[PDB]
């Protein structure tokens, strides 16, 4: 169970990094569309 929890935590860190990058990209796209309008 500890090994499974460690694997799940690694996957959760990967997913959190991916979500942070996606949010950053979305905010960048939004700011670009705002400044270009």
């Amino acid at each position: 169970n500890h090994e499974a929890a460690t694997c799940l935590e690694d996957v959760v860190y990967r997913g959190d990094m991916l979500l942070e990058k996606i949010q950053s990209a979305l905010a960048d796209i939004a700011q670009s569309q705002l400044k270009t309008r």
């Binding site: 991916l18 990209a25 796209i29 670009s32 569309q33 270009t36 309008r37």
Partner: protein, 62 residues
């Protein structure tokens, strides 16, 4: 005609038609601001195209 009928009526009708066509167009102000807005829209379209292109480049997901 006078070198040696209702020509003035037809001329006035043509002038009124030309004025109506000019007012129907929409551009009242000088074309300077129109060209400025067109350049701004072109810049915005270029920015949107560049953003859409850059979006399809960074593809590092699983």
């Amino acid at each position: 005609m006078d070198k040696d009928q209702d020509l003035n009526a037809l001329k006035t009708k043509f002038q009124e038609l030309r004025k109506l066509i000019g007012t129907m167009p929409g551009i009242h102000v000088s074309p300077e601001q129109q060209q400025q807005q067109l350049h701004s829209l072109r810049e915005q379209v270029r920015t949107k195209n560049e953003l859409l292109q850059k979006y399809k480049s960074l593809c590092m997901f699983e």
